[PDB]
Write a protein that binds this ligand. Structure first.
Ligand SMILES: CS(=O)(=O)Nc1ccc2c(c1)S(=O)(=O)C=C(c1c(O)c3cc(F)ccc3n(Cc3ccc(F)cc3)c1=O)N2
Ligand code: NI
Length: 557
């Protein structure tokens, strides 16, 4: 029962790979310690292969089957529809990997004849053949970190023609089913404002709260054939067209359960019997399987008044404390149960009695004060990786702009406002590119976003208080200051000074640019404008935001 078998062929790059931080004239204004930042490359793929390759053992008890029965009962209330070829085509990212069969992502989006023709042949084949393993490409992801060096993560995906077919069969299912089955525990339904409120209200709902995050070592590799057949049984509980059932069975047997791995040169690298990281059902599958195992493990452990929050493989549990000793015992049982279910821990779980000390979806709750002095909770994180990536994106154009996703998701934080907003608007001013739409990724989906829309986007996700926060916590101030020292980033007093300049320049231009100056940089000026609700921030179409997760799912909105 091995996650992978290997031939010995190497995982190969598609193009040249830089590992050292590229430097330009803008670099030093963000960060001086350039040797701290690196990107992963295929050169480390072998170490990752070793990490992700292990034997899985699975022992399944009555708690597991009881939870599954209840999930299936909820799944049976879902009705999902087939997407048409063109609906599915318009969900494809413009810079998605081209097909091996002589067509690309733009041909798919234009509904060109050769793309549409091939897609129909793949669909027909899915319907006739439920046995032949489908080919996947395996690649090393190039991602940017700060030192303490990780090996490249691996992405496994099928051909573009198959991906469009997955959308036809499954897009409506993976978008709709998770919230029906998990209700309030499904994380991807929440904007950042709604996530913080949920965590705080849950913490507050317990007489004596205790919470913990659970880190599964290599979740994707822990997913067994059983787990993936179990997901399919859940999907099949939905009210589906007969053609959708046949396609889902087929993709399950031929793709989701496993298949051969091919490098960028077309050589055979080996074989997969675990979760593929680049299929449509990666996020929904991981979410269902994480929630199933964790729910069953909560019962095994006898945790009292358990509330879970689940985003794929990321899990937080908040419950009633039974004292520090019985809590420690409960968590050992939880971890033994997950372990028997094929989800052993990386870092073993710790009981926490302070909400601010729990990290989940790479983020912790912290507290600041708005214009009225009233306390507001908001989500933050250690800004090291966000700033290392902004350093890279200062000297190189990248298809996805992490600085922009980070401003969107962490708008209330002191580091996003002072450093990220200041640095990148100054860059957009100097190049006259304020009006140019940029791509970023939120909950695995790709979005085209106009930066001049940032203030409306932020008021909607966070509320106006995001533009007025002050008096941040000492732990948060210390973590930021600590990151600025490590990376060699200029002090917050230098950023305030630049932000005054950026602000005044934005005000000069009027329109949406002036509104950015006013809302985004109100913190920079000695005596503040009283900010009021933005007119445009009621007209933005944020539908298709905070519905579901789509990690590796090749989704564009
Ligand atoms: C592979 S899996 O099994 O599905 N696991 C998985 C777990 C979490 C997660 C994703 C996948 S995602 O790929 O769907 C993107 C986010 C994810 C983002 O796309 C995101 C983007 C930003 F630009 C800034 C912060 C972000 N945060 C942190 C965050 C989450 C929620 C908040 F309210 C605020 C920050 C995320 O977790 N979360
Ligand atoms: Ni029972």
């Amino acid at each position: 029962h091995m996650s992978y078998t290997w031939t010995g062929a190497l995982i190969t790059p598609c193009a040249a790979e830089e590992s050292k931080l590229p430097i330009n004239a803008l670099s030093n204004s963000l960060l001086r310690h350039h040797n701290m930042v690196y990107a992963t490359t295929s050169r480390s793929a072998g170490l990752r292969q070793k990490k992700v390759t292990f034997d899985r053992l699975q022992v399944l008890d009555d708690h597991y089957r009881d939870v599954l029965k209840e999930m299936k009962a909820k799944a049976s209330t879902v009705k999902a529809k087939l997407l048409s070829v063109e609906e599915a085509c318009k969900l494809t990212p413009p810079h998605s990997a081209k097909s091996k069969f002589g067509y690309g992502a733009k041909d798919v989006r234009n509904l060109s004849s050769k793309a549409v023709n091939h897609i129909h042949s793949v669909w027909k084949d899915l319907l006739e053949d439920t046995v032949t393993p489908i080919d996947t490409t395996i690649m090393a992801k190039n991602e940017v970190f700060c030192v303490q060096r990780k090996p490249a993560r691996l992405i496994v995906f099928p051909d573009l023609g198959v991906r469009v077919c997955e959308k036809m069969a499954l897009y409506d299912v993976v978008s709709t089913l998770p919230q029906v089955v998990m209700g309030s525990s499904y994380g991807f339904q929440y904007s950042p404002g709604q996530r913080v409120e949920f965590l705080v209200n849950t913490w507050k709902s317990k007489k004596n709260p205790m919470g913990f995050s659970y880190d599964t070592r290599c979740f994707d590799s822990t997913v067994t054939e059983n787990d993936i057949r179990v997901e399919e049984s859940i999907y099949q509980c939905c009210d589906l067209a007969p053609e959708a059932r046949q396609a889902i069975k087929s993709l399950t047997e031929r793709l989701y359960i496993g298949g051969p791995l091919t490098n960028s040169k077309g050589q055979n690298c080996g074989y997969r019997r675990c979760r593929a990281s680049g299929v449509l059902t990666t996020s929904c599958g991981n979410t269902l399987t994480c929630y199933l195992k964790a729910s069953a493990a909560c019962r095994a452990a006898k945790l009292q008044d358990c509330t879970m929050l689940v985003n794929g493989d990321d899990l937080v549990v908040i419950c009633e404390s039974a004292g520090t000793q019985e809590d420690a015992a409960s968590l050992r049982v939880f971890t033994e149960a997950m372990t028997r279910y094929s989800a052993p821990p990386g870092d073993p779980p710790q009981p926490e009695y302070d909400l601010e000390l729990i990290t989940s979806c790479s983020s912790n709750v912290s507290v600041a004060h708005d214009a009225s002095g009233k306390r507001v909770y908001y989500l933050t994180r250690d800004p090291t990786t966000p700033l290392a990536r902004a350093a890279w994106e200062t000297a190189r154009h990248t298809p996805v702009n992490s600085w922009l996703g980070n401003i969107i998701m962490y708008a209330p934080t002191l580091w996003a406002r002072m450093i990220l907003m200041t640095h990148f608007f100054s860059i957009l001013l100097a190049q006259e590119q304020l009006e140019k739409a940029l791509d970023c990724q939120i909950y695995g989906a790709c979005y085209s976003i106009e930066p001049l829309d940032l203030p409306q986007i932020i008021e909607r996700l966070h509320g106006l208080s995001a533009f007025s926060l002050h008096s941040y916590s000492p732990g948060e101030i210390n973590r930021v200051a600590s990151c600025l020292r490590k990376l060699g980033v200029p002090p917050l007093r230098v950023w305030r000074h630049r932000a005054r300049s950026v602000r005044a320049r934005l005000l000069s231009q009027g329109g949406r640019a002036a509104t950015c100056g006013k809302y985004l940089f109100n913190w920079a000026v000695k005596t503040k404008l009283k900010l009021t609700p933005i007119p445009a921030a009621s007209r933005l179409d944020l539908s298709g935001w905070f519905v579901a997760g789509y990690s590796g799912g090749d989704i564009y909105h």
